[PDB]
Amino acid sequence: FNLDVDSPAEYSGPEGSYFGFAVDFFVPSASSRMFLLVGAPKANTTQPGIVEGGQVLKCDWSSTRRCQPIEFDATGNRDYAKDDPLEFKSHQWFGASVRSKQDKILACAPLYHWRTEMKQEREPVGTCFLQDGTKTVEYAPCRSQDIDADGQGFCQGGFSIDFTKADRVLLGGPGSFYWQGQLISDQVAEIVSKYDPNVYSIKYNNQLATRTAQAIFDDSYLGYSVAVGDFNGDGIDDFVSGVPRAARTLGMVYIYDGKNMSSLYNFTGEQMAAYFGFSVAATDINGDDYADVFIGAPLFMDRGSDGKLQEVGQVSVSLQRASGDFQTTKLNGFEVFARFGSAIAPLGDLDQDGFNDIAIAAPYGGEDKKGIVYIFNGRSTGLNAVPSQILEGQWAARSMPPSFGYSMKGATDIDKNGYPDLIVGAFGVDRAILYRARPVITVNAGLEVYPSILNQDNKTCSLPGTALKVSCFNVRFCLKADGKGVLPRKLNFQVELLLDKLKQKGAIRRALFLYSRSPSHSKNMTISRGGLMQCEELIAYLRDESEFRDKLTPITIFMEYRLDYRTAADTTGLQPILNQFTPANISRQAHILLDCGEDNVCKPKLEVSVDSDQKKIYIGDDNPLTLIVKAQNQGEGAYEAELIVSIPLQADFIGVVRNNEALARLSCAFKTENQTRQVVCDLGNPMKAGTQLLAGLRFSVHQQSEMDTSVKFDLQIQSSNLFDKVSPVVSHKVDLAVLAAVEIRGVSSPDHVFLPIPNWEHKENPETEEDVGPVVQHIYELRNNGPSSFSKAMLHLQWPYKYNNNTLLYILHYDIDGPMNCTSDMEINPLRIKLGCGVAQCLKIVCQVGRLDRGKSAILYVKSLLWTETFMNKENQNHSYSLKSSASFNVIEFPYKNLPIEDITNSTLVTTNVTW
Amino acid sequence: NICTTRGVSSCQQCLAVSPMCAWCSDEALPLGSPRCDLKENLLKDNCAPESIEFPVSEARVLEDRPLSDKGSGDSSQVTQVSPQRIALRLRPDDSKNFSIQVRQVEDYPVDIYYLMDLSYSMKDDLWSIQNLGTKLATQMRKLTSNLRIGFGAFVDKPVSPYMYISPPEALENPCYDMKTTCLPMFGYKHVLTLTDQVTRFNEEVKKQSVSRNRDAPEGGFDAIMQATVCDEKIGWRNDASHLLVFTTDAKTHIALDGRLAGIVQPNDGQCHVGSDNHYSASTTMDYPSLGLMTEKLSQKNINLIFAVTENVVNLYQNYSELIPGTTVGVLSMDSSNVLQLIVDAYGKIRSKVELEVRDLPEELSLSFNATCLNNEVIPGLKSCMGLKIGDTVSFSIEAKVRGCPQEKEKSFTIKPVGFKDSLIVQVTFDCDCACQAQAEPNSHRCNNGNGTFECGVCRCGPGWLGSQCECSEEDYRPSQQDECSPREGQPVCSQRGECLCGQCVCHSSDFGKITGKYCECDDFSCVRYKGEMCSGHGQCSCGDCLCDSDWTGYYCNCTTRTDTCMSSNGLLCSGRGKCECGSCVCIQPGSYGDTCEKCPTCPDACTFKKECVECKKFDRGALHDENTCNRYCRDEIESVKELKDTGKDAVNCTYKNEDDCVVRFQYYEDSSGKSILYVVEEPE
């Protein structure tokens, strides 16, 4: 919110040269000055016979906005032999990627083609130039002897680059190995030392590189974008790279160990063709020293109202945890076709509040499509999902969308004021623009009024120059200001003070200042940045009783303060800014004495009672929890009386009871502050003597820790009265309950079988199912529907196996789905094929199941064959079969050991009729 | 009456309270009478009926031409949507319901544009379609009488990475290394404009030749965009069905892939096919994104058919789900079965009707109840499927307005997907009553002027208040006891205001405006859900969060859109539940899952089908007695005498009839989506 959008520094490059495609800062340790680096991939150069060779320009600050090219390479194409060019630098897009670290500059030309040393080919291997102070050396890891497209020929090395803390270069070529992509990492020391202008295929010893893989991974574009951070705790930066076309074009992000290039983690997109992985960034966004991963999906389509898909873009934020797992949340764009998430630039600590920030670009948003950049601030709980600022492009399209925000870079304090700054590229119009961060000032205001309760008969002071005595009270207000970075020693503040500020329109105000006669007072205060609070005082008096009517409504004292930024601006004209999340005004109240009459002061007696209908609560459900609260004052009036509710770890507030008749309706409110959370409801200002009040509040509560057995509520009443400030404290308790309602059910397919079986005949020994008879399947499902889960249970299956010495149904093979393991007392398929148990011999099956949660279930599949020979025997005996099977279960242990367990058991019955 | 307790201030304020509020402009009204309440109660006070200001919202049909019965005729006569224009007038927060009919008119003209991949792999395919022009005409002759055919081809962007650029012979003959000749690479070339002389198709196709590119993915989408937007060049007829047959056998390049080639300019969606029939911006403009492709397909009313080989059918099946209105079919490696593919795809396209809304004002909301075949009514659903050519379906639409907007007239369009015909809705708002036409500012009718007299009580200006503006701001005499309190013992204005001359004036507000004769109503203190307050899909007045027409609930947290409840087979909640707030709630035992499709313990599948075969064989069954069995028998029925066991997934099932005989039948469904069952002729 503190980025200066009023007077940014604007740089311009040659027309049509894509000036601003890549941007970066340059901070040479050998010099005090600092520069901007801007890449112009299509700029014409002085090289012999080279067209659109590309350029990198060094633009300075604190001077004329003049940009000058860096002479990385002054030569043309080398010759392999007489009239046989070795390389083709024309249209090489040099400067498409730029990075720097201290005095090192690395720029690459992804579209650099060369004629291999074995054929007359023309292959885009890509090349990079590294400038280390005075020495300049070419770096082309992909220009090796693995020439064909199945090797590194079409690597386009340098498509994306980055530096690590240990002075390693990370380079990505999305074309290696049939466009599988590749990552290559080399030590900057080895690159410089091993350089040789006469060797076109140099080999580096300590190189780390990924390797070719199966053909299924072709056209993945690994290395489309790269980032570096520590993701295994060894202090060595690991490699993060986006793979936008991986996994059927779902997109993926690979994290490779930074010391041996072994895989660590993978992220996968949710929508195809969204290009998940177009950009990536690694930075600590919540101040825990664990780097967090940001992934952009510019073309992501989400569903708005009515479900229509719209292309808004999305960014995935993943917070790293010490356990090695990532807590991920999604962040969507705001405009259609704006490609939100095109660029992600860590800003460092933009406002110096202790947490890093981040900027996300939508290079085609805003009015028309000039582009927009969003700034997001980091909290201790992660990224703040609301952008604190919006930067808007200011240049209209010439022949191409300006693309303001297509490339950004931050985290460098160019003006050394103590806050990092930001560069935004607009290569569409060939411009780059620098935004400076304004110093942030935090102001602590104070306001107090000692004689809060005013006795209009307490005539103490006298008006100046007149004999009238008036009841008057003191008003004391203070200011304290501080801030990090370069700020002036003294800050000028203008304070406006209002009495009876609740009066509006032409209504007469009941209070006036003593020395003056107006209800308003304004003062200019000079505050020195320091810890000691500075205060000032004034005397206000009540208007005579004859002039005003309202005795009940409180008198509101209102203070607002402003900072004149023009006076505090630094030498360059950069104005400070007040902190965004602190109010610019503060209020107090003074109450007339409402005839308490005891001793001209009011003695309240606040008392409460709380109750509920939910005598007990379950672990998780559609919580209807509610509380009915009684509040009463048995003493004299209470000023600014209010009810405070404090809640445990998990709880929520739904609102006051609206539908009930006798239930009183109140303007309750909810806030969380001082690492605590409460509900606040004004009981009446003031509550009259003997006042009786009854109200009810709706809550929502679900438990997941299993660490406790009951939930609680603690209540209090507070007022502004002199002595009886607080009511006696009360508490409410509700016990947890476990209700893991479970049901066991089954079905049989078919529901019936008719004999004689078509196309069947008796055989001495059967070998295939149709030799035995038709197939029968019995199915059972153990399901949990209750609010509560259970961790283990067991089920039984009772199945007839012999009646009148006849086999009946014949087991063939099991099948299940869920966390159980089963066993039976008799062999499965005893013969190698490729009317219940109360009267017939039985086969028994036993199985124990693991944790089934709410809505989860386990299914047992048993498929058998009807031994129709035995049923022909039955037909000869001429009886009928309502063949039957049964099952039962029992829960054995809940995960809520801290709570009393209750036995749950039931059984089900299934059948399969057989008739002629 | 709600109107009395909240309005009464003026005519405009009264009518905005609720649809049923009425205002009395008659000056003869008895003093102290309620001047704003529902008319039937108001008239008892003898307010002149002619002076009552009680506007009523209405929907009036302007253009209603009957649906056509046959597509063969004149362009201006064929009508597939009725009514064609409707005038809609609404009150500040009222709603009205109207209907629409849609017909898949038979014998409608068809346009087929054949967009073919011409990579070297498709050399065999190009030989198979050398007579597709005549064969396609013969097959389509039985469905339509006004067929038109066109042709076009694509390979990929003729640039580096994608193109061979060495040796220099490779530029003129990319197949140089294979000792064979093929055309130089091209992005997209238009060949044949949609014409009815189908013989031209064969002549043009016989002259084509394949090309060769380096990488596997192709540039098809970049060609789909140009085939869509270049309407005059391609030759689309506005009054005809538009089929775009897109054939390929490889992956496809997508947006942001062009950055490797040095192309960073986003696709602009314009037509860049020059006089030489070549897509000129191929080498300077990135591929189109799926969103832009969908937008341009919807605008031009073009149905896209993916005819792709089996090695990539899964990929384009998933792509098609992100481009609603598209079909996928499996193409043979030889392209020998493309004719049947096209014919089947055409049937699928015309078997479904789905509505679409254009330029709906932000203050409006719509809810649909579809009346599909057999009088089936599906609330909340705006599309039917399973139709045959010539069938008619109807929808019921209800429109509601989010309070009176500033603009007085606005319009929007309701249109079926792929249809030229549409319904144009003209919306009007009548928030201001007629009596306002004769306002008298600062007239002697108002105390000391200082106000405006309109429709009744004068609108007091600064410095005056009360009836007739007789009380000045400086009087505020406390002698009044003019009922200035909700109930004695409670403050005069509930502490939210101060009573002056008997009328409360509400004091400052946090982030809204306070209203009511006791300041008891506001538009910012509504209920909250998980800390969101009112959901924002509705009003927030007097603490009530009141939702739009397509949103519901005391918290407005409940949707009404049914897309999330749509099963993969295309019917609601698998037929086992209802959608509720975008989440199917199953109504039969054992059914669970997002769409009640996971039921493992449901009875044997043939059990459900036995009740249908009862309908389709014999005069028995409760559903047949209801005559509703045709609704439930969606599956094809064929009679046999010996069960066709020659099937991998056919379910052989039987049951005992009420008669002594036994019934035999089978069932299965295939990838095409057709569900069929065979029934034995005579019971055993």
PDB file of N, CA and C in Angstrom, chain A residues 93 111 113 120 154 156 159 219 221 224 245 248-249 272-273 275 299 307 311 339 364 406 503-504 654 658 685 688 745 752 754 781 783, chain B residues 160 166 214 217 252-253 255-257 259-260 262 266 289-290 318-319 322 489 495 498 507 528 542 544 554 561 589-590 592 600-601 654-655:
ATOM      1  N   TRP A  93      17.120 -13.248 -29.787  1.00  0.00           N
ATOM      2  CA  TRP A  93      16.390 -12.868 -28.580  1.00  0.00           C
ATOM      3  C   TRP A  93      17.317 -12.757 -27.374  1.00  0.00           C
ATOM      4  N   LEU A 111      16.913 -18.251 -28.383  1.00  0.00           N
ATOM      5  CA  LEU A 111      16.713 -18.625 -29.775  1.00  0.00           C
ATOM      6  C   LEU A 111      18.001 -18.554 -30.587  1.00  0.00           C
ATOM      7  N   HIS A 113      20.688 -20.204 -32.699  1.00  0.00           N
ATOM      8  CA  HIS A 113      20.905 -21.398 -33.501  1.00  0.00           C
ATOM      9  C   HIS A 113      22.375 -21.513 -33.873  1.00  0.00           C
ATOM     10  N   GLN A 120      25.698 -29.903 -41.448  1.00  0.00           N
ATOM     11  CA  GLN A 120      25.344 -28.535 -41.798  1.00  0.00           C
ATOM     12  C   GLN A 120      23.947 -28.221 -41.282  1.00  0.00           C
ATOM     13  N   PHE A 154      17.782 -28.996 -29.592  1.00  0.00           N
ATOM     14  CA  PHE A 154      16.740 -27.987 -29.505  1.00  0.00           C
ATOM     15  C   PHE A 154      16.496 -27.540 -28.074  1.00  0.00           C
ATOM     16  N   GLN A 156      17.352 -24.889 -26.286  1.00  0.00           N
ATOM     17  CA  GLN A 156      17.073 -23.485 -25.995  1.00  0.00           C
ATOM     18  C   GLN A 156      17.446 -23.150 -24.556  1.00  0.00           C
ATOM     19  N   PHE A 159      16.302 -20.272 -21.412  1.00  0.00           N
ATOM     20  CA  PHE A 159      14.921 -19.809 -21.436  1.00  0.00           C
ATOM     21  C   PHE A 159      14.523 -19.210 -20.097  1.00  0.00           C
ATOM     22  N   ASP A 219       7.399 -33.446 -24.698  1.00  0.00           N
ATOM     23  CA  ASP A 219       6.626 -32.208 -24.766  1.00  0.00           C
ATOM     24  C   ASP A 219       6.112 -31.785 -23.397  1.00  0.00           C
ATOM     25  N   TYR A 221       8.167 -29.567 -21.430  1.00  0.00           N
ATOM     26  CA  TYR A 221       8.714 -28.221 -21.261  1.00  0.00           C
ATOM     27  C   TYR A 221       9.231 -27.997 -19.843  1.00  0.00           C
ATOM     28  N   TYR A 224      10.582 -24.389 -18.163  1.00  0.00           N
ATOM     29  CA  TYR A 224       9.905 -23.207 -18.683  1.00  0.00           C
ATOM     30  C   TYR A 224      10.106 -22.018 -17.754  1.00  0.00           C
ATOM     31  N   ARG A 245       3.341 -28.272 -19.414  1.00  0.00           N
ATOM     32  CA  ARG A 245       2.679 -29.229 -20.290  1.00  0.00           C
ATOM     33  C   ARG A 245       2.704 -30.654 -19.756  1.00  0.00           C
ATOM     34  N   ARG A 248      -0.494 -34.742 -19.159  1.00  0.00           N
ATOM     35  CA  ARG A 248      -1.598 -34.506 -20.088  1.00  0.00           C
ATOM     36  C   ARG A 248      -1.938 -33.020 -20.163  1.00  0.00           C
ATOM     37  N   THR A 249      -0.922 -32.172 -20.026  1.00  0.00           N
ATOM     38  CA  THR A 249      -1.090 -30.719 -20.027  1.00  0.00           C
ATOM     39  C   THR A 249      -1.862 -30.235 -18.805  1.00  0.00           C
ATOM     40  N   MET A 272      -6.845 -28.819 -17.096  1.00  0.00           N
ATOM     41  CA  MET A 272      -6.010 -29.007 -18.273  1.00  0.00           C
ATOM     42  C   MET A 272      -5.931 -27.724 -19.087  1.00  0.00           C
ATOM     43  N   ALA A 273      -4.756 -27.472 -19.655  1.00  0.00           N
ATOM     44  CA  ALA A 273      -4.475 -26.314 -20.497  1.00  0.00           C
ATOM     45  C   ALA A 273      -4.446 -25.007 -19.717  1.00  0.00           C
ATOM     46  N   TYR A 275      -2.074 -24.177 -17.965  1.00  0.00           N
ATOM     47  CA  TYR A 275      -0.663 -23.808 -17.992  1.00  0.00           C
ATOM     48  C   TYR A 275      -0.124 -23.606 -16.579  1.00  0.00           C
ATOM     49  N   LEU A 299      -4.037 -19.103 -17.337  1.00  0.00           N
ATOM     50  CA  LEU A 299      -5.218 -19.403 -18.131  1.00  0.00           C
ATOM     51  C   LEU A 299      -6.247 -20.233 -17.376  1.00  0.00           C
ATOM     52  N   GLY A 307     -22.439 -20.862 -12.887  1.00  0.00           N
ATOM     53  CA  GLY A 307     -21.571 -21.967 -13.237  1.00  0.00           C
ATOM     54  C   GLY A 307     -20.793 -21.821 -14.523  1.00  0.00           C
ATOM     55  N   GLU A 311     -12.151 -17.347 -17.875  1.00  0.00           N
ATOM     56  CA  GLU A 311     -10.693 -17.405 -17.804  1.00  0.00           C
ATOM     57  C   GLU A 311     -10.195 -16.230 -16.971  1.00  0.00           C
ATOM     58  N   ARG A 339      -5.282 -12.807 -17.484  1.00  0.00           N
ATOM     59  CA  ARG A 339      -4.139 -13.686 -17.249  1.00  0.00           C
ATOM     60  C   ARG A 339      -3.460 -13.357 -15.922  1.00  0.00           C
ATOM     61  N   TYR A 364      -2.941  -7.999 -18.776  1.00  0.00           N
ATOM     62  CA  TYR A 364      -3.988  -7.607 -19.711  1.00  0.00           C
ATOM     63  C   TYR A 364      -5.269  -7.181 -19.009  1.00  0.00           C
ATOM     64  N   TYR A 406       4.154  -7.898 -17.368  1.00  0.00           N
ATOM     65  CA  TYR A 406       4.587  -9.190 -17.883  1.00  0.00           C
ATOM     66  C   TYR A 406       5.868  -9.663 -17.216  1.00  0.00           C
ATOM     67  N   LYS A 503     -24.260  14.838  17.497  1.00  0.00           N
ATOM     68  CA  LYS A 503     -25.203  15.817  16.969  1.00  0.00           C
ATOM     69  C   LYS A 503     -24.931  16.065  15.491  1.00  0.00           C
ATOM     70  N   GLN A 504     -25.999  16.139  14.694  1.00  0.00           N
ATOM     71  CA  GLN A 504     -25.858  16.299  13.254  1.00  0.00           C
ATOM     72  C   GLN A 504     -26.834  17.374  12.795  1.00  0.00           C
ATOM     73  N   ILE A 654     -23.316 -17.227  15.203  1.00  0.00           N
ATOM     74  CA  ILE A 654     -24.253 -17.157  14.087  1.00  0.00           C
ATOM     75  C   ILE A 654     -25.132 -15.911  14.134  1.00  0.00           C
ATOM     76  N   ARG A 658     -33.658 -14.425  16.100  1.00  0.00           N
ATOM     77  CA  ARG A 658     -34.492 -13.425  15.446  1.00  0.00           C
ATOM     78  C   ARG A 658     -35.973 -13.778  15.499  1.00  0.00           C
ATOM     79  N   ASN A 685     -27.128   1.608  26.888  1.00  0.00           N
ATOM     80  CA  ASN A 685     -26.236   2.666  27.361  1.00  0.00           C
ATOM     81  C   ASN A 685     -27.061   3.870  27.798  1.00  0.00           C
ATOM     82  N   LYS A 688     -30.910   0.865  32.810  1.00  0.00           N
ATOM     83  CA  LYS A 688     -31.627   1.554  33.871  1.00  0.00           C
ATOM     84  C   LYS A 688     -31.684   0.691  35.129  1.00  0.00           C
ATOM     85  N   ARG A 745     -25.801 -53.783   5.647  1.00  0.00           N
ATOM     86  CA  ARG A 745     -26.831 -54.100   4.671  1.00  0.00           C
ATOM     87  C   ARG A 745     -26.208 -54.873   3.519  1.00  0.00           C
ATOM     88  N   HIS A 752     -33.117 -64.360  -7.703  1.00  0.00           N
ATOM     89  CA  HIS A 752     -33.711 -65.678  -7.850  1.00  0.00           C
ATOM     90  C   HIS A 752     -33.037 -66.399  -9.007  1.00  0.00           C
ATOM     91  N   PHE A 754     -33.805 -69.858 -11.694  1.00  0.00           N
ATOM     92  CA  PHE A 754     -34.788 -70.804 -12.205  1.00  0.00           C
ATOM     93  C   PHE A 754     -34.061 -71.987 -12.831  1.00  0.00           C
ATOM     94  N   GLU A 781     -22.394 -54.128   2.806  1.00  0.00           N
ATOM     95  CA  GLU A 781     -21.772 -52.826   2.992  1.00  0.00           C
ATOM     96  C   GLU A 781     -21.895 -52.409   4.450  1.00  0.00           C
ATOM     97  N   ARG A 783     -21.440 -49.311   6.745  1.00  0.00           N
ATOM     98  CA  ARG A 783     -21.432 -47.872   6.531  1.00  0.00           C
ATOM     99  C   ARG A 783     -21.664 -47.152   7.848  1.00  0.00           C
TER     100      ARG A 783
ATOM    101  N   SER B 160      10.548 -21.746 -36.512  1.00  0.00           N
ATOM    102  CA  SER B 160      11.587 -22.557 -35.891  1.00  0.00           C
ATOM    103  C   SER B 160      11.001 -23.353 -34.726  1.00  0.00           C
ATOM    104  N   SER B 166      16.804 -26.623 -42.261  1.00  0.00           N
ATOM    105  CA  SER B 166      18.108 -27.014 -42.772  1.00  0.00           C
ATOM    106  C   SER B 166      18.041 -28.466 -43.215  1.00  0.00           C
ATOM    107  N   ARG B 214       8.290 -30.881 -37.229  1.00  0.00           N
ATOM    108  CA  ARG B 214       9.311 -31.517 -36.405  1.00  0.00           C
ATOM    109  C   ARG B 214       8.719 -32.151 -35.151  1.00  0.00           C
ATOM    110  N   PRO B 217       3.116 -32.210 -31.265  1.00  0.00           N
ATOM    111  CA  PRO B 217       1.876 -31.427 -31.225  1.00  0.00           C
ATOM    112  C   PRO B 217       1.699 -30.598 -32.488  1.00  0.00           C
ATOM    113  N   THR B 252      -2.019 -31.330 -29.403  1.00  0.00           N
ATOM    114  CA  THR B 252      -2.269 -29.993 -29.914  1.00  0.00           C
ATOM    115  C   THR B 252      -1.514 -28.961 -29.091  1.00  0.00           C
ATOM    116  N   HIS B 253      -0.974 -27.962 -29.782  1.00  0.00           N
ATOM    117  CA  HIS B 253      -0.387 -26.819 -29.104  1.00  0.00           C
ATOM    118  C   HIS B 253      -1.484 -25.958 -28.492  1.00  0.00           C
ATOM    119  N   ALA B 255      -2.230 -22.191 -25.842  1.00  0.00           N
ATOM    120  CA  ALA B 255      -1.751 -20.836 -25.626  1.00  0.00           C
ATOM    121  C   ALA B 255      -0.508 -20.850 -24.748  1.00  0.00           C
ATOM    122  N   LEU B 256       0.367 -19.871 -24.979  1.00  0.00           N
ATOM    123  CA  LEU B 256       1.618 -19.712 -24.242  1.00  0.00           C
ATOM    124  C   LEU B 256       2.664 -20.732 -24.674  1.00  0.00           C
ATOM    125  N   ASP B 257       2.308 -21.637 -25.588  1.00  0.00           N
ATOM    126  CA  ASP B 257       3.318 -22.505 -26.182  1.00  0.00           C
ATOM    127  C   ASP B 257       4.165 -21.753 -27.195  1.00  0.00           C
ATOM    128  N   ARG B 259       5.644 -19.034 -26.982  1.00  0.00           N
ATOM    129  CA  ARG B 259       6.773 -18.287 -26.442  1.00  0.00           C
ATOM    130  C   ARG B 259       8.097 -18.937 -26.812  1.00  0.00           C
ATOM    131  N   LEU B 260       8.121 -20.263 -26.954  1.00  0.00           N
ATOM    132  CA  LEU B 260       9.346 -20.932 -27.377  1.00  0.00           C
ATOM    133  C   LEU B 260       9.780 -20.454 -28.754  1.00  0.00           C
ATOM    134  N   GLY B 262       9.290 -17.481 -29.928  1.00  0.00           N
ATOM    135  CA  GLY B 262       9.431 -16.040 -29.953  1.00  0.00           C
ATOM    136  C   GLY B 262       8.141 -15.303 -30.213  1.00  0.00           C
ATOM    137  N   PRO B 266      -0.653 -12.091 -27.609  1.00  0.00           N
ATOM    138  CA  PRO B 266      -1.821 -12.960 -27.441  1.00  0.00           C
ATOM    139  C   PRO B 266      -2.700 -12.967 -28.680  1.00  0.00           C
ATOM    140  N   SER B 289      -6.419 -19.437 -26.541  1.00  0.00           N
ATOM    141  CA  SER B 289      -6.745 -20.158 -25.322  1.00  0.00           C
ATOM    142  C   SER B 289      -8.143 -20.758 -25.423  1.00  0.00           C
ATOM    143  N   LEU B 290      -8.406 -21.750 -24.573  1.00  0.00           N
ATOM    144  CA  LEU B 290      -9.700 -22.418 -24.615  1.00  0.00           C
ATOM    145  C   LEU B 290     -10.839 -21.453 -24.324  1.00  0.00           C
ATOM    146  N   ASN B 318     -11.179 -34.895 -22.522  1.00  0.00           N
ATOM    147  CA  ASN B 318     -11.035 -33.985 -21.392  1.00  0.00           C
ATOM    148  C   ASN B 318     -11.037 -32.533 -21.850  1.00  0.00           C
ATOM    149  N   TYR B 319     -10.451 -32.248 -23.015  1.00  0.00           N
ATOM    150  CA  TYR B 319     -10.532 -30.892 -23.552  1.00  0.00           C
ATOM    151  C   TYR B 319     -11.976 -30.504 -23.839  1.00  0.00           C
ATOM    152  N   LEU B 322     -14.120 -28.872 -21.180  1.00  0.00           N
ATOM    153  CA  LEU B 322     -13.883 -27.461 -20.916  1.00  0.00           C
ATOM    154  C   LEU B 322     -14.431 -26.554 -22.007  1.00  0.00           C
ATOM    155  N   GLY B 489     -41.690   3.150  27.950  1.00  0.00           N
ATOM    156  CA  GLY B 489     -40.618   2.550  28.712  1.00  0.00           C
ATOM    157  C   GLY B 489     -39.359   2.293  27.915  1.00  0.00           C
ATOM    158  N   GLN B 495     -32.706   5.000  20.906  1.00  0.00           N
ATOM    159  CA  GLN B 495     -31.347   5.512  21.058  1.00  0.00           C
ATOM    160  C   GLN B 495     -30.652   5.687  19.713  1.00  0.00           C
ATOM    161  N   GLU B 498     -33.150  11.066  17.627  1.00  0.00           N
ATOM    162  CA  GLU B 498     -33.739  12.019  18.554  1.00  0.00           C
ATOM    163  C   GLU B 498     -35.081  12.480  18.009  1.00  0.00           C
ATOM    164  N   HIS B 507     -29.518   9.196  13.978  1.00  0.00           N
ATOM    165  CA  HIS B 507     -28.193   9.795  14.029  1.00  0.00           C
ATOM    166  C   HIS B 507     -27.215   8.958  13.203  1.00  0.00           C
ATOM    167  N   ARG B 528     -25.382 -13.169   9.640  1.00  0.00           N
ATOM    168  CA  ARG B 528     -24.067 -13.562   9.155  1.00  0.00           C
ATOM    169  C   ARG B 528     -23.926 -15.078   9.136  1.00  0.00           C
ATOM    170  N   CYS B 542     -33.489  -3.899   6.796  1.00  0.00           N
ATOM    171  CA  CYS B 542     -34.034  -4.125   8.134  1.00  0.00           C
ATOM    172  C   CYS B 542     -33.486  -5.413   8.741  1.00  0.00           C
ATOM    173  N   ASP B 544     -32.527  -8.124   7.273  1.00  0.00           N
ATOM    174  CA  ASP B 544     -32.866  -9.338   6.545  1.00  0.00           C
ATOM    175  C   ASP B 544     -32.073  -9.394   5.247  1.00  0.00           C
ATOM    176  N   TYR B 554     -32.247 -17.991   4.313  1.00  0.00           N
ATOM    177  CA  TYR B 554     -32.181 -16.837   5.196  1.00  0.00           C
ATOM    178  C   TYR B 554     -30.809 -16.182   5.181  1.00  0.00           C
ATOM    179  N   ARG B 561     -28.230 -23.251  -8.951  1.00  0.00           N
ATOM    180  CA  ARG B 561     -27.714 -23.809 -10.191  1.00  0.00           C
ATOM    181  C   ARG B 561     -27.464 -25.304 -10.032  1.00  0.00           C
ATOM    182  N   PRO B 589     -32.282 -45.959  -0.479  1.00  0.00           N
ATOM    183  CA  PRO B 589     -31.255 -46.487   0.426  1.00  0.00           C
ATOM    184  C   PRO B 589     -29.955 -46.823  -0.286  1.00  0.00           C
ATOM    185  N   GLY B 590     -28.851 -46.565   0.412  1.00  0.00           N
ATOM    186  CA  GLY B 590     -27.535 -46.957  -0.040  1.00  0.00           C
ATOM    187  C   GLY B 590     -26.892 -46.025  -1.039  1.00  0.00           C
ATOM    188  N   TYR B 592     -25.039 -42.908  -2.393  1.00  0.00           N
ATOM    189  CA  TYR B 592     -24.153 -41.876  -1.875  1.00  0.00           C
ATOM    190  C   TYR B 592     -23.237 -41.427  -3.005  1.00  0.00           C
ATOM    191  N   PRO B 600     -23.719 -49.245  -4.264  1.00  0.00           N
ATOM    192  CA  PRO B 600     -23.245 -50.603  -4.554  1.00  0.00           C
ATOM    193  C   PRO B 600     -24.295 -51.662  -4.263  1.00  0.00           C
ATOM    194  N   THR B 601     -25.155 -51.383  -3.289  1.00  0.00           N
ATOM    195  CA  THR B 601     -26.126 -52.353  -2.800  1.00  0.00           C
ATOM    196  C   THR B 601     -27.499 -52.191  -3.433  1.00  0.00           C
ATOM    197  N   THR B 654     -33.700 -62.695 -15.925  1.00  0.00           N
ATOM    198  CA  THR B 654     -35.005 -63.325 -16.058  1.00  0.00           C
ATOM    199  C   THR B 654     -35.817 -63.039 -14.805  1.00  0.00           C
ATOM    200  N   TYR B 655     -37.134 -63.184 -14.926  1.00  0.00           N
ATOM    201  CA  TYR B 655     -38.017 -63.047 -13.779  1.00  0.00           C
ATOM    202  C   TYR B 655     -39.296 -63.825 -14.048  1.00  0.00           C
TER     203      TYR B 655
END
